């Protein structure tokens, strides 16, 4: 089971986001743990986490975070994706972030 941590600012609707997340992992059987942190738990929490995403709030802070994690895949969540609460589309983000990664 990989682990998928998003970080950001806004903790309300990181929350929806990842329990939207949660139920399409479990719709498709995808062997993933979805955990969302404040942005200050980036460097901590980051370290466990088997791909790292920002949400948009936060994305001016990419460089500093890969810096921190720099043995880690690190993307921002596409800002329409976030907006709208696509669980299933950020689901898809953060899977093909894992392969290009290891590949």
């Known amino acids: 089971k990989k682990h998928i941590y998003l970080f950001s600012s806004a903790g309300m609707s990181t ?3 990842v329990s939207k997340m949660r139920a399409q ?3 498709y059987e995808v062997p993933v743990i979805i955990e969302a942190f404040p942005e200050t738990l980036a460097g901590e929490k980051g370290q ?3 791909v790292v995403l920002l949400g948009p709030q936060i994305a001016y802070m990419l ?3 890969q810096r921190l ?3 880690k895949p690190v993307e921002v969540i596409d800002s329409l994706l976030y907006g709208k609460v696509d669980g ?3 689901l898809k983000a953060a899977v093909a972030a894992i ?3 290891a590949a």
Do not use: H, R, T
Request: no cysteine.
């Open 25 to 27: 992992a479990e719709k």
């Open 99 to 101: 392969k290009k990664a």
């Open 69 to 71: 994690l720099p043995n």
């Open 88 to 90: 299933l589309g950020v």
């Open 48 to 50: 466990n986490a088997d």
């Open 15 to 17: 929350s929806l986001l």
């Open 63 to 65: 460089p500093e975070i």
